[PDB]
Structure formats: C-alpha cells, structure tokens
Design an enzyme around this catalytic site. Structure first.
Site, PDB file in Angstrom:
ATOM      1  N   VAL A 166      11.705  -6.700   8.068  1.00 32.14           N
ATOM      2  CA  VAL A 166      11.324  -6.880   6.666  1.00 32.14           C
ATOM      3  C   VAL A 166      12.112  -5.992   5.702  1.00 32.14           C
ATOM      4  O   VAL A 166      12.268  -4.785   5.931  1.00 32.14           O
ATOM      5  CB  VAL A 166       9.809  -6.673   6.441  1.00 32.14           C
ATOM      6  CG1 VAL A 166       9.444  -6.915   4.975  1.00 32.14           C
ATOM      7  CG2 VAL A 166       8.994  -7.595   7.348  1.00 32.14           C
ATOM      8  N   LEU A 222       4.394  -6.336  -1.871  1.00 29.67           N
ATOM      9  CA  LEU A 222       3.302  -5.437  -2.220  1.00 29.67           C
ATOM     10  C   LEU A 222       3.750  -4.005  -2.007  1.00 29.67           C
ATOM     11  O   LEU A 222       4.534  -3.719  -1.111  1.00 29.67           O
ATOM     12  CB  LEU A 222       2.014  -5.764  -1.463  1.00 29.67           C
ATOM     13  CG  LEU A 222       1.245  -6.990  -1.978  1.00 29.67           C
ATOM     14  CD1 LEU A 222       1.668  -8.221  -1.211  1.00 29.67           C
ATOM     15  CD2 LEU A 222      -0.255  -6.802  -1.859  1.00 29.67           C
ATOM     16  N   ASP A 241      -4.910  -9.402  14.501  1.00 27.85           N
ATOM     17  CA  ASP A 241      -4.119  -8.182  14.395  1.00 27.85           C
ATOM     18  C   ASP A 241      -4.417  -7.414  13.107  1.00 27.85           C
ATOM     19  O   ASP A 241      -3.506  -6.951  12.410  1.00 27.85           O
ATOM     20  CB  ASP A 241      -2.623  -8.489  14.530  1.00 27.85           C
ATOM     21  CG  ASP A 241      -1.776  -7.235  14.671  1.00 27.85           C
ATOM     22  OD1 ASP A 241      -2.210  -6.273  15.340  1.00 27.85           O
ATOM     23  OD2 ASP A 241      -0.661  -7.214  14.106  1.00 27.85           O
ATOM     24  N   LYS A 272      -5.009  -4.368  11.407  1.00 27.58           N
ATOM     25  CA  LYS A 272      -4.897  -2.926  11.429  1.00 27.58           C
ATOM     26  C   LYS A 272      -4.462  -2.548  10.022  1.00 27.58           C
ATOM     27  O   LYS A 272      -3.964  -3.402   9.288  1.00 27.58           O
ATOM     28  CB  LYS A 272      -3.874  -2.487  12.480  1.00 27.58           C
ATOM     29  CG  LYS A 272      -2.526  -3.170  12.381  1.00 27.58           C
ATOM     30  CD  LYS A 272      -1.657  -2.812  13.556  1.00 27.58           C
ATOM     31  CE  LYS A 272      -0.257  -3.388  13.389  1.00 27.58           C
ATOM     32  NZ  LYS A 272       0.604  -3.119  14.581  1.00 27.58           N
ATOM     33  N   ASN A 309      -1.201  -3.840   8.532  1.00 23.63           N
ATOM     34  CA  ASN A 309      -1.082  -5.238   8.136  1.00 23.63           C
ATOM     35  C   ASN A 309      -1.929  -5.586   6.921  1.00 23.63           C
ATOM     36  O   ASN A 309      -2.115  -6.761   6.614  1.00 23.63           O
ATOM     37  CB  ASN A 309      -1.430  -6.174   9.300  1.00 23.63           C
ATOM     38  CG  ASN A 309      -0.513  -5.992  10.511  1.00 23.63           C
ATOM     39  OD1 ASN A 309       0.597  -5.466  10.407  1.00 23.63           O
ATOM     40  ND2 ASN A 309      -0.979  -6.436  11.667  1.00 23.63           N
ATOM     41  N   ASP A 347       1.059 -10.146   7.933  1.00 23.20           N
ATOM     42  CA  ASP A 347       1.507 -10.413   9.308  1.00 23.20           C
ATOM     43  C   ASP A 347       0.568 -11.309  10.115  1.00 23.20           C
ATOM     44  O   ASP A 347      -0.346 -10.828  10.788  1.00 23.20           O
ATOM     45  CB  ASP A 347       1.809  -9.124  10.069  1.00 23.20           C
ATOM     46  CG  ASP A 347       2.965  -9.282  11.048  1.00 23.20           C
ATOM     47  OD1 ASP A 347       3.282 -10.424  11.444  1.00 23.20           O
ATOM     48  OD2 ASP A 347       3.565  -8.249  11.429  1.00 23.20           O
TER      49      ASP A 347
HETATM   50  C1  LIG Z   1       3.066  -6.736   7.423  1.00 25.75           C
HETATM   51  C2  LIG Z   1       3.665  -5.457   8.001  1.00 25.75           C
HETATM   52  C3  LIG Z   1       5.063  -5.248   7.439  1.00 25.75           C
HETATM   53  C4  LIG Z   1       6.006  -4.771   8.549  1.00 25.75           C
HETATM   54  O1  LIG Z   1       6.659  -3.530   8.226  1.00 25.75           O
HETATM   55  N1  LIG Z   1       4.993  -4.347   6.301  1.00 25.75           N
HETATM   56  C5  LIG Z   1       5.045  -4.847   5.052  1.00 25.75           C
HETATM   57  N2  LIG Z   1       4.950  -4.015   3.995  1.00 25.75           N
HETATM   58  C6  LIG Z   1       4.997  -4.474   2.726  1.00 25.75           C
HETATM   59  N3  LIG Z   1       4.894  -3.635   1.684  1.00 25.75           N
HETATM   60  C7  LIG Z   1       4.416  -2.281   1.868  1.00 25.75           C
HETATM   61  C8  LIG Z   1       5.605  -1.392   2.067  1.00 25.75           C
HETATM   62  C9  LIG Z   1       5.833  -0.807   3.303  1.00 25.75           C
HETATM   63  C10 LIG Z   1       6.949   0.011   3.488  1.00 25.75           C
HETATM   64  C11 LIG Z   1       7.826   0.226   2.429  1.00 25.75           C
HETATM   65  C12 LIG Z   1       7.589  -0.366   1.193  1.00 25.75           C
HETATM   66  C13 LIG Z   1       6.479  -1.178   1.016  1.00 25.75           C
HETATM   67  N4  LIG Z   1       5.152  -5.776   2.532  1.00 25.75           N
HETATM   68  N5  LIG Z   1       5.222  -6.420   1.291  1.00 25.75           N
HETATM   69  C14 LIG Z   1       5.370  -7.749   1.550  1.00 25.75           C
HETATM   70  C15 LIG Z   1       5.400  -7.886   2.926  1.00 25.75           C
HETATM   71  C16 LIG Z   1       5.532  -9.189   3.609  1.00 25.75           C
HETATM   72  C17 LIG Z   1       6.638  -9.197   4.659  1.00 25.75           C
HETATM   73  C18 LIG Z   1       4.197  -9.580   4.212  1.00 25.75           C
HETATM   74  C19 LIG Z   1       5.245  -6.572   3.570  1.00 25.75           C
HETATM   75  N6  LIG Z   1       5.203  -6.171   4.852  1.00 25.75           N
END
Ligand SMILES: CC[C@H](CO)Nc1nc(NCc2ccccc2)n2ncc(C(C)C)c2n1
Lengths: 264, 268
Positions: B19, B84, B128, B130, B133, B146
């Site tokens: 990501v 986000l 999942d 946690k 997520n 996720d």
């Molecule tokens: C779902 C878990 C994912 C994997 O690292 N983390 C994550 N974090 C953030 N944002 C919180 C974040 C985390 C680390 C650095 C900056 C922002 N976002 N924002 C949109 C998405 C989509 C891929 C679902 C996402 N996935």
C-alpha cells in the site's frame, strides 16, 4: 443457533433476492453467439460436474462457475474451440472464491487434457475477471436451497439431496432454465424433492419468506418436472452418476412422481 | 494507466500486496494504492484479491473503507482506495499516556458495529478485525479495512478456513477448532478492540494458542475505568457461547450508545 444467523437471515435473504436480479445473464444470449449452441454448453456444464467430483469441490463452486460462464458469454463472442477454456477459467475463479483448498492451476490444465496451455488458462482468468468486472459474489440456487432446508419439520436427508440434484440438473439446460432466477429454481426444486420423498408441499413458512406460491412457481415446476422425468434419457449424464452415491443417498435412483396435481 | 498518480510514501503491507499514499495529479485527491503483483506463469490472481475486490464493490457504507477504482495491467493490479490518515493501532499507541476520551471510544465502537452489522447484513465475514485494519480520519470517522481475509458466507454456514484471525483477536470457537463458526467471531474481535481502546493495550496478548486460551479462561472465568453500561456490553461481546454472544445489530441498541455523539479525535 448463531450458525443459522438469526439476527441477519431476513436481511441476507432480501439482499440475495436483490442481487440475483443483477447477476442474471441475458435470457437469449445463445441466440446471439454465432459459433456456440445450447447443446455445446450442456457438454461443458456436465464436464464441470465431472471436474467437481474428481477434485471433490463444493457444489456452490459449480453453481458459481456456471453463473460466471453465462455472464461472460452474455457479453463475449466465443468460438467453439475456446468454450472449454472459458469454462476452465470459470471453475478456477469459482474455486479461488469459494474453496478452502482450491486445486492449483496445474490441476485445471490437466483436466482440459492439455488442449490449452497454462498461460492460456491464466490469461482467460484475467479476461473473465475484466468482463465480470470482478463481481463474483453471485447468489446461487444452492444459497437459496440451503436456507429453504431450514424450514423442514424435521430435516430429511433424502429431500435435501434430491433438492440439490434437481437444482443441479437445471444448470445443464439453458433452455429453459436461463429464464428462471436461482431463488425460483431452488423453490421449485425444493417442492419437487419434498413431494417425492415425504409427500408434502412447499411449506407455508416459506411462502411468507419468499412471496412465492405454487401458482407463481407453476411454470418452473412443470419445466423441472419434465427434466426430472426425462433425466435418464438426457445426453448429459454426470449429475445422475454423481447422485447415485451413498454420499447423496442415491436420490437419482429414485422414481420421479408421475404427476403433481394442482388445477381446477 | 498510473500516469495520473504520484507516489508519496509507503504505507505498509496488508494481508496481501503493498500500500502507498499517492496523489491524483489531475484532481488533487489523496488516495491509497494497494499494489498486487501477478503471477502469470504460475498461479494467477490471488483469491485474497478476488474476494476483497468482489466484496468491497458490493459493500458501500460510511464505516467500510471505500474502493474507488480497479486498474489492470498484464502483470500488476492496482486497487485505488480512499486515503485515511491513520489506523486505530497507531492512534492507541499515540494515546498510551493521555488516554482516549470516552465519548470518542463510544463513537468508534458505535461506528465499528454499524460497519460490521452492514457486513453481516450482506453475508460477509471480515475475519481479520484488528486495530491495524481499522482506519480513522480527522473528521471523526472509523472504517473497516483490509477485506483480504474476508469471506461471503451462506445460511447456514459451513466449515470455512481455520487459519483465520490473528491470535490476539481470535474467538474461542476458532481456537478450539469447532467445525462451524459464524458472525460471532467478528463480534469477539470488536469486543477485544473495545477493551483495547479503554486500556490502550491488547486484552488477550497470547504467546501461543494454549496461552491464548488460558488468558481467556482467567478473565471470563472457567477493564477498570469503564461504566456499568460499558461492562455489560463488553461481557455480552465476549460471551464464550457464540449463540449467546451479542450480534452487532443488537449491540447498536445497547443502553451504552444511548448518549452517543461523533467527536473529532484529539491528536492529528
Ligand atoms: C488496511 C491495512 C493497511 C496495510 O498497511 N494500512 C492502511 N493504512 C491506511 N492509512 C493509515 C496509514 C498508515 C500508515 C501510514 C499512513 C497512513 N490506509 N488508508 C487507506 C488504506 C487502504 C489501502 C484501505 C489504508 N491501509
């Protein structure tokens, strides 16, 4: 219990009922495919059943792949020599979606008798995904049946298996079954199976649930009864072979009821 | 295809793929790109991708992360998501000393339940949940993210994958390997997460499956700063019996949420 999801089954049923309309392939897609026919599709769907047996896959997996195929062929012109490749890709896709342990890709190349290459299967997979725009969570005859089984008083294993069997037979014959919704096919299948074994009818509880009465289910019943009656003479035979086993209680060896009874 | 998007930073790695924070050079929109490599000589498009994409296209809710676009190539698959600003885990860690204000906790639980109820309403287990997520913005919203380990269930359920939710958030029926499991497993998780928002540390941080079990048996028999209402809901979210366990739908009607609002999170 919680496994029957009491707080959500109504919500879930409505959504499946709403989605089966949006996942429905076009009724006369075979009329617009210049190279392939209903007969050819029947060969294919029957072959998928054989694949389903050899690799001991879930019936849900079979029902999904058939939905994937009809939808694909509802938008893409496919030549005869490529019909099976589509079908193979559909089964893979359905397996990946539904199976805890989907067969590896190499195993899907094997059952196509090495007519196609691994790469071709892989490319068709992506092609199927694009055409279906990744919308793979289609409601199936099975998802409805399995809900209807909860209305048995009490449960009957011969009925359930026979219901499965009839619904499965419908996948083979695009004429007529393409023009009925999974929920309707399941409903007719359930009535027909129940009536054969126990001797009773589409339950009143499932009338308030579905909004279907035998009078609404009439056209489907008649078609499904026909298919049942004719089943031993059908060109395709793998579903009957499948349902002779103790696994399915041998419900295909049962005699279809001569008539159903319903009119003034 | 990806000409329009500009990578900013690496966000991390979910259940599958990678990501990135990115910006649409044309619209100015900040997105998160889930990059998925294929895999063409083997083995195809991973079932995790197929499931997340198929399901997330269906599920459209304020408390479920929004999938914006799916961009194909021959070798790469890019999911375009709404961005986000951070996840519940980093927020809790950021709030280790200060605490998280209770009306915020209430809000987050309320929303998480609303999102989860919408999942369950549409035959989808998340499997999942946690804090990693669960994503929060600056407006005050929290979202489920996720869906890589998600599954579309049937009624009634059948045997699904066992190796399913991360140890600390795993329900007893999964731990003891009961042939059937259902929507209750997601509730259990939100239960552990509720507790975690209060104390700002995992409720059952087990080192092994056995240890996980024992930790559960200690607590529930075989969270101090929370009001009478809060505890009631908690213990109803953490009932051993999955049949007895509260449903998300019923959890939204708990007296605990009678006075709920939607506060903006302290901290950036
Ligand atoms: C779902 C878990 C994912 C994997 O690292 N983390 C994550 N974090 C953030 N944002 C919180 C974040 C985390 C680390 C650095 C900056 C922002 N976002 N924002 C949109 C998405 C989509 C891929 C679902 C996402 N996935």
């Amino acid at each position: 219990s919680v496994n029957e999801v009491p707080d959500y089954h109504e919500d879930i049923h409505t959504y499946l009922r709403e989605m089966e309309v949006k996942c429905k392939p076009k009724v006369g897609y075979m009329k617009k495919q210049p190279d392939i026919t209903n007969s050819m599709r029947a060969i294919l769907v029957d072959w998928l059943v054989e694949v389903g047996e050899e690799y001991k896959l879930q019936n849900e997996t079979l029902h999904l792949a058939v939905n994937y195929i009809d939808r694909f062929l509802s938008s893409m012109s496919v030549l005869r020599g490529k019909l099976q490749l589509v079908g193979t890709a559909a089964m893979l896709l359905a397996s990946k979606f539904e199976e805890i342990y989907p067969p590896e890709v190499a195993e899907f190349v094997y059952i196509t008798d090495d007519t196609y290459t691994k790469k071709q299967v892989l490319r068709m997979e992506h092609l199927v995904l694009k055409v279906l725009a990744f919308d793979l969570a289609a409601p199936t005859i099975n998802q409805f049946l399995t809900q209807y089984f909860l209305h048995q008083q009490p449960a009957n294993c011969k009925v359930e298996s026979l219901a499965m069997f009839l619904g499965e037979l419908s996948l083979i014959d695009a004429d007529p079954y393409l023009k009925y919704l999974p929920s309707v096919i399941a409903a007719a299948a359930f009535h027909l199976a129940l009536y054969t074994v126990t001797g009773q009818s589409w339950p009143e509880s499932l009338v308030q649930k579905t909004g279907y009465t035998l009078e609404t289910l009439k056209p489907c019943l008649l078609d499904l009864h026909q298919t049942y009656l004719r089943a031993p003479q059908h060109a395709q035979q793998s579903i009957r072979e499948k349902y002779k086993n103790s696994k399915y209680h041998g419900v295909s060896l049962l005699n279809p009821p001569e008539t159903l009874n319903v009119e003034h | 295809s990806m000409e329009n998007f500009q990578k900013v930073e690496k966000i991390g790695e979910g259940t599958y793929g990678v990501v990135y924070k990115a910006r649409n050079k044309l619209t100015g929109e900040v997105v998160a790109l889930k990059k998925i490599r294929l895999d063409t000589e083997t083995e195809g498009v991973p079932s995790t991708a197929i499931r997340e994409i198929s399901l997330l296209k269906e599920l459209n809710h304020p408390n479920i992360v929004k999938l914006l676009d799916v961009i194909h190539t021959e070798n790469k698959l890019y999911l375009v998501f709404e961005f986000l600003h951070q996840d519940l885990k980093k927020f809790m860690d950021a709030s280790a000393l200060t605490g998280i204000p209770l009306p915020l906790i209430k809000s987050y639980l309320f929303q998480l339940l609303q999102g989860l109820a919408f999942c369950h309403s549409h035959r989808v287990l998340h499997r999942d949940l946690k804090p990693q997520n669960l994503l929060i913005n600056t407006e005050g919203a929290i979202k489920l993210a996720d869906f890589g380990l998600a599954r579309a269930f049937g009624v009634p359920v059948r045997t699904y994958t066992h190796e399913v939710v991360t140890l600390w958030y795993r329900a007893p029926e999964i731990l003891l390997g009961c042939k059937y499991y259902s929507t209750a497993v997601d509730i259990w998780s939100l239960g552990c997460i509720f507790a975690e928002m209060v104390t700002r540390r995992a409720l059952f941080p087990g080192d092994s499956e056995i240890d996980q079990l024992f930790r559960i048996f200690r607590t529930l028999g075989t969270v101090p700063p929370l009001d009478e209402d809060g505890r009631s809901l908690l213990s109803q979210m953490l009932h051993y019996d999955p049949n007895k366990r509260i449903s998300a739908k019923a959890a939204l009607a708990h007296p605990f949420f009678q006075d709920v609002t939607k506060p903006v999170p302290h901290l950036r």
